């Protein structure tokens, strides 16, 4: 998907955008001044149906990461799993291309 083929996104085919940028949210809390504050918050998986504007937002709980390593890698896998689950949930009529 490109600047070129953006118009392709709004044909009559069903699609899901999947943002896993915000899955492991770590926070270092900062206001407009810039004070430090260390923490490791809950995360999310943004999944969007730009036809309907449904937003299947899986809220990743922080309990996930307790005693976990290769954390980043794990996150990706988790996201994938979530996506799969979502797909399964969707009926064939509503499922995405």
């Amino acid at each position: 998907l490109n600047s070129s083929n953006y118009a392709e996104l709004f044909n009559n085919d069903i699609k899901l955008f999947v943002d896993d940028t915000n899955v492991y949210r770590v926070t270092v809390h900062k206001t407009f001044e810039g004070n430090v504050a260390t923490k490791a918050i809950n995360g999310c998986i943004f999944t969007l149906n730009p036809k309907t504007g449904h937003l299947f937002l899986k809220i990743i709980h922080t309990s996930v990461w307790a005693g976990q390593k290769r954390l980043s890698q794990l996150a990706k896998w988790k996201t994938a799993e979530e996506v799969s689950a979502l797909v399964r949930s969707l009926p064939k009529e509503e499922q995405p291309k």
Binding site: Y6, A7, L9, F10
Partner: protein, 52 residues
Amino acid sequence: LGLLPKPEPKVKLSNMMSVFENDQNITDPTAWEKVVKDQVDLRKRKHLEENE
């Protein structure tokens, strides 16, 4: 052999997303929408006006 008028691109709400000859098409989304919807209305209105 004239250029007495000009021919523009006939947008609609299915084109909308795909026309770029006229500007603002993602830039100003709702403005663009207004333009395109407005255009459509005019077309329809023109037809109706003609009928009248």
